Every structure is written in structure tokens, then in C-alpha cells.
Design a protein around this ligand. Structure first.
Ligand SMILES: CC(C)c1cc(C(=O)N2Cc3ccc(CN4CCN(C)CC4)cc3C2)c(O)cc1O
Length: 221
């Protein structure tokens, strides 16, 4: 008791659940495209707030800088992507992250079943789920103007939660935290991240900064 937090439990829409189970339980080569999908989503969100701001500068009250940060953390085997885009409302999380059918799900599963490369995922409108190629749990923290901050979370298994987040306030935008699987820690390495960004995500119209830890003082190693 004491403190109270709204936390809502949802089932993924049946075909989304079937897709996630394929993604997780089937071997697929060329998983590095998960990063491309995340950066694409950030870029679209950033485009949206920039566009709205042409007409209403006040929409930038919550964060004037439009950018993306990539944060690998070897301490807890996470890779976080943060952007200062338009963010999502509660309904946007619920609609976009699982509760309803997505047009391309079935066809995408049929393509995978035929041997398509996982890279096609983005075209089918289910790109977010590529996170599950590398992560056993994904947390999405989001904040849209005129709404409160929310945190979506799922370790697959057919369920996800949406909670009102009173933690680290983001101002405005989305932060995706990938808890990487043991056989996917390569994505924590600066060398690998740089390689995949150069390969798949060139000319993103916003600065991308990689946070690195290379100067830690020995006295606090
Ligand atoms: C977790 C994924 C999905 C993700 C989302 C965002 C984010 O906050 N977004 C807000 C937003 C607004 C517009 C668009 C462009 N399209 C999307 C499809 N829609 C039906 C029409 C508008 C995209 C987004 C994504 C994010 O910043 C990063 C993420 O990884």
C-alpha cells in the first residue's frame, strides 16, 4: 500500500502474440536491423514534433532540442534509445504497442514462414517487435504534451503492462530500454553500434550521440 500507481495489464492481440512467439522462438539471422527500426521510429516522432512546432513553438516548452541518444550499459546489459520526439499518449501506447491488430502482421508471418529475411519487418508495420530478436524484456517510457508520462513493459509471453510512470521524467519523447539476451550482448559494444548505425541508419535528420564509458576513474571502477 502506501503509494499507489495505475498499472494496467493487457494481452497482445492474437496475431501480434503469434508473431512475437515466432520472433523469440525461431532462429533468424541478421538481427542487427532492430536498431534501424528503433531509430526510424525515433526519427518519425522527431519529425512530428518538429512539424507541429512550425505552427506552435509552445509545443517545444517541454524540450527544445530534437535529438537521439544511444546508451549501452554493460552493468545491467541494457541498450537504451532515447529521443525527444512527440512522444505517445496513453491511447497511442495501447493502440500501437499491442492491443489491436496491425494490418501487416499475418502477411509478415507468412513471409517469415517462407524464409523472408527478418529485415522486411519494418515494411510490414510491425518493426517495433524486432526488439524481441535481441531483448528478453523491453520497457518503453513515453511523454506527450498535455498527457502524463507512461511506461509500457513486456517480456512477451502474450502480455504487456501500461503504467503511469512517476519515475525519471523525460520532458517529452520516448525512451526504449532493451534488456538484451545473453547471446546478444554484442550490441553493447561501441564498435558494433557504430558499425550498424553507419550501415543501416545514415542521414537521420537529427543528431545521434553514443554514450560511452571510457574514462571511468580507477578509484570508483
Ligand atoms: C516504441 C516505438 C513504437 C517508438 C515510438 C516512438 C514515438 O514516440 N512515436 C510517436 C510517433 C508519432 C508519429 C509517428 C509516425 N507515424 C507512425 C504510425 N502512425 C499510424 C502514423 C504516424 C511515429 C511515432 C513514434 C519513438 O519515439 C520511438 C520508438 O521506438
Amino acid at each position: 500500500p502506501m503509494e499507489e500507481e495505475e498499472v494496467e495489464t493487457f494481452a497482445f492481440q492474437a496475431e501480434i502474440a503469434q508473431l512475437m512467439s515466432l520472433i523469440i522462438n525461431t532462429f533468424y539471422s541478421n538481427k542487427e536491423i532492430f536498431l534501424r527500426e528503433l531509430i526510424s521510429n525515433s526519427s518519425d516522432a522527431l519529425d512530428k514534433i518538429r512539424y507541429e512546432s512550425l505552427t506552435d513553438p509552445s509545443k517545444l516548452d517541454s524540450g527544445k532540442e530534437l535529438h537521439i541518444n544511444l546508451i549501452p550499459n554493460k552493468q545491467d546489459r541494457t541498450l537504451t534509445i532515447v529521443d525527444t520526439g512527440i512522444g505517445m499518449t496513453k491511447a497511442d501506447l495501447i493502440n500501437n504497442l499491442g492491443t489491436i491488430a496491425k494490418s501487416g502482421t499475418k502477411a509478415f508471418m507468412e513471409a517469415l514462414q517462407a524464409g523472408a529475411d527478418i529485415s522486411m519487418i519494418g515494411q510490414f508495420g510491425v518493426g517495433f517487435y524486432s526488439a524481441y530478436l535481441v531483448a528478453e524484456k523491453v520497457t518503453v517510457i513515453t511523454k506527450h504534451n498535455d498527457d502524463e508520462q507512461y511506461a509500457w513493459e513486456s517480456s512477451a509471453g502474450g502480455s504487456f503492462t501500461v503504467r503511469t510512470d512517476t519515475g525519471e521524467p523525460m520532458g517529452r519523447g520516448t525512451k526504449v530500454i532493451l534488456h538484451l539476451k545473453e547471446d546478444q550482448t554484442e550490441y553493447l559494444e561501441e564498435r558494433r553500434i557504430k558499425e550498424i548505425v553507419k550501415k543501416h541508419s545514415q542521414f537521420i535528420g537529427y543528431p545521434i550521440t553514443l554514450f560511452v564509458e571510457k574514462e571511468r576513474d580507477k578509484e570508483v571502477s
